[PDB]
From a paper:
Env changes conformation to facilitate viral entry upon binding to CD4 on target T cells.
CH55 Fab crystallized as Fab alone, space group P1 with a = 74.0 Å, b = 74.0 Å, c = 75.9 Å, α = 106.8°, β = 108.4°, and γ = 91.8°, and in complex with gp12093TH057 coree in space group P6122 with a = 90.6 Å, b = 90.6 Å, c = 409.0 Å, and γ = 120.0°. Crystals diffracted to 2.46 Å and 3.8 Å with 3 Fabs or 1 complex in the asymmetric unit, respectively. Interestingly, we found much of the CDR H3 disordered in the unbound CH55 Fab structure even given its modest length of 13 amino acids, implying that its structure rearranges upon binding to gp120. The constant part of the CH55 Fab accounts for much of the difference between the bound and unbound structures, with an average main chain RMSD of 2.48 Å for the full Fab and 1.06 Å for the variable part.
Author numbering:
A (entry chain L): 1 to 95, 95A, 96 to 212
B (entry chain H): 1 to 52, 52A, 53 to 82, 82A, 82B, 82C, 83 to 96, 100, ...
Write the structure that this text describes.
Amino acid sequence: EIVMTQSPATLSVSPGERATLSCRASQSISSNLAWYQQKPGQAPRLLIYGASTRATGTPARFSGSGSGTEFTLTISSLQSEDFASYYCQQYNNWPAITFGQGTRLEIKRTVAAPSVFIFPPSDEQLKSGTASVVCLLNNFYPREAKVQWKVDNALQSGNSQESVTEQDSKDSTYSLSSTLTLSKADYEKHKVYACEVTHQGLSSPVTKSFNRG
Amino acid sequence: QVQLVQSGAEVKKPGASVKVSCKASGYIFISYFMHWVRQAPGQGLEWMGIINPSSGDTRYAQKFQGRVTMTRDTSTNTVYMELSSLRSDDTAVYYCARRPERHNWLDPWGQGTLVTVSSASTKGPSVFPLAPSSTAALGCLVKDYFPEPVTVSWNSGALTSGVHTFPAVLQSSGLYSLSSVVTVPSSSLGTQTYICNVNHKPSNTKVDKRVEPK
């Protein structure tokens, strides 16, 4: 019944600068707050407790101030291994603990426009009752990218799925894929299949399309 | 040293029950409470409850009071979390965490156990190629498998740079779909063999698809 609300949901900041997250409590928890870092595919590791006390092994660039309802974690000089997810946790009344929603820390880099590609259904997949057209947005930044599908200029709605990868290790960019699934009957009934990409690194939307055949 | 080791991943049909173990090593099991929390990739961490190993006394979060039962075995020094009436939003990673007075902040945590809630049956992934026409982008749509995970390596591990393997998406069928795509110099196709090797260990599947075009 005490609720913790995490500052912004996501934060991108250039490596080596400063990063500030803020945990908020509906009920005053006095001091009484911990922080956790978690890398993807791994469990959360303890970072700070009692709002300000670094945990064993927690480096000195991680600090935290609090007391009351609003708290703050600060990382001075970002580092490669700090970009991860961060959760605050409360223990105001003893056994009951509630976590925050989380703030994901991302690497801020230069704007990069996506390299777009489109791929028709393979002639082994049409032998069943499905057809999949795949649109790839390779190596772009920031995360924000709006891809739309149009078949015979008919704008598709609620029949594509989007998946974005984790920030690349060498480039710190993202890649994205929009997969549009149709029935084979619906696929061979139409000719022009187009994927239009909108991104802040693009002077104008990039339309990559093909014809059935 | 301080180590929590839980059981492996499990797949449940809706409405069943799941029992996750958590074995301690490197400390006095009888002296430190065990928390269970969970993480679904639609929210953050959800605390499930607290058990006292020496006593076995429990207190559960209001959200789970009734469905969850926490137990322990002092001999084998293991905590158990049992969740019942499994609905489809209970698929998540489940963590046990040791509590280091009135200082409740959890450290260390277990490896986590992935529990999937679905009535889909074990199924091999069907592989389809993503050939490039006019650097070039080639790909592999591994489609309609259950359960996760899958392993995709290009060229039996030969080509690695430029490879982007996408996280799996759960389709309306209840089956998963994911694609892997790599960029290569355009002149290299017509000269070099680019194979997409996927394996699915849950369902005896080892598929190799040559990904060539036009």
